[PDB]
Amino acid sequence: MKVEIDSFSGAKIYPGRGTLFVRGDSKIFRFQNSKSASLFKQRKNPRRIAWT
């Protein structure tokens, strides 16, 4: 049973948690919650988000 990383916050996604998103080309994305996903969706830059 794996544990993935948030592809924004770099947090730990345990089974069943968060959400998965499959962009246009085919790159797969992962968010541990509605927070990192919302930031990604606004196109924030993680390198600017303090807690990342």
Binding site: M1, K12, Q32, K35
Partner: protein
């Protein structure tokens, strides 16, 4: 003149009346059919639901797209500390039904139980079973006499037991008392088992084992007075409708000139008794165990209690039943847990399960870490600490 289109009725007519249940402790209305050739043992159990959480496991279902594959599953953990036999009841078949013949109580009943028999315990003389305890003064006799009676006339035997509510997080000091049917052998062998256990204790690993389907009797969460839309799943009227739209448009035809017992009306939703069946046992908790929450795959030393504690409940100091999926009633409420009334060969019911991991994150928020250990390792040393 015939409804223009067909649709099914709303609501089930066999869960009527939709009122508030009597007790908050739901009744067991049936016990499994006794096979009087197996050892004596309880047939149901008292416990307090704590909360839910997530599981992982491989699947064992040959022919499924997910056979030999990990699945995640919601589970609910009910806080189930050992129960205490304080008495026995003798039931006799009659042409008017079962009948309680006598009841024989134990010599020393704790305050937990004693409490139940009172409405203002603090200002009471606590005279509860004081003159009954005198029956034990004699060599035996009066108690031995009534014990002999059940052996002669009773056709079914139930033990009285009660929760040790104090072992749990709850503010309630008063313990819940329940009858449970003895399904071991001979009627004689029964009351014997019962006398032998007076004042003594019984745990849940003596009733339920893993992979067992069990049923779960309980009183549903309450919601007070409800409109017909959410209470019945009635359709929501158009927006233009004068006088609101969470109603139903036609309470009835002209004849019968009477609102009928089957059309949907506003009123109580929730606090109903439900017997919910075929819940499979995923893990039987050992209280003494420091590895409640661990696995043969994830070996880290942790218990079942989630980080931050079970929300609105507390911690699990005790033995617990992990059941698959969900259970009626809400956190803190008592739940009778009962063996199946039948021998299911569902395959879904014969599957032996072994968990791979047990989500132990906080539920009070979007939990990231499983153990305080892990939080540290990941975030590093903070401004407090050291």
């Amino acid at each position: 003149s015939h409804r223009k289109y067909e649709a099914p009725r709303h609501g089930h007519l066999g869960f009527l009346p939709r009122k508030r249940a009597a007790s908050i402790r739901a009744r067991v209305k049936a016990f499994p059919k006794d096979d009087r050739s197996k050892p004596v043992a309880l047939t149901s159990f008292l416990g307090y639901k704590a909360g839910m959480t997530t599981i992982v496991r491989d699947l064992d279902r040959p022919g499924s797209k997910f056979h030999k594959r990990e699945v995640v599953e919601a589970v609910t953990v009910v806080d189930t500390p050992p129960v205490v036999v304080v008495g026995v009841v003798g039931y006799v078949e009659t042409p008017r039904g079962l009948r309680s013949l006598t009841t024989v109580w134990a010599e020393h009943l704790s305050d937990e139980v004693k409490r139940r028999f009172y409405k203002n315990w603090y200002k009471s003389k606590k005279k509860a079973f004081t003159k009954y305890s005198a029956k034990y003064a004699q060599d035996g006799a009066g108690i031995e006499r009534e014990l002999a009676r059940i052996k002669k006339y009773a056709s079914v035997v139930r033990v009285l037991v009660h929760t040790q509510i104090r072992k749990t997080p709850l503010a309630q000091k008063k313990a819940h008392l329940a009858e449970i049917q003895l399904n071991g052998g001979s009627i004689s062998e029964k009351v014997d088992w019962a006398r032998e256990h007076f004042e003594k204790t019984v745990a849940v690993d003596s009733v339920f084992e893993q992979n067992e389907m069990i049923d779960a009797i309980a009183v549903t969460k309450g919601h007070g007075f409800e409109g017909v839309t959410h209470r019945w799943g009635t359709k929501k009227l158009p927006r233009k409708t004068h006088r609101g739209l969470r109603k139903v448009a036609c309470i009835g035809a002209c004849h019968p000139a009477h609102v009928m017992w089957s059309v949907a009306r506003a009123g109580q939703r929730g606090y109903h008794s439900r017997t919910s069946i075929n819940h499979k046992i995923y893990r039987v908790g050992k209280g003494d165990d420091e590895a409640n929450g661990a696995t043969s795959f994830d070996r880290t030393k942790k218990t079942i209690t989630p980080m931050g504690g079970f929300v609105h409940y507390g911690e699990i100091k005790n033995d617990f039943i992990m059941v698959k999926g969900c259970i009626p009633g809400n956190r803190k409420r008592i739940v009778t847990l009962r063996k199946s009334l039948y021998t299911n060969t569902s395959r879904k019911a014969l599957e032996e399960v072994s968990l791979k991991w047990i989500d132990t994150a906080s539920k009070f928020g979007k939990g990231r870490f499983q153990t305080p250990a892990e939080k540290h390792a990941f975030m590093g040393t903070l401004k407090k600490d050291l």
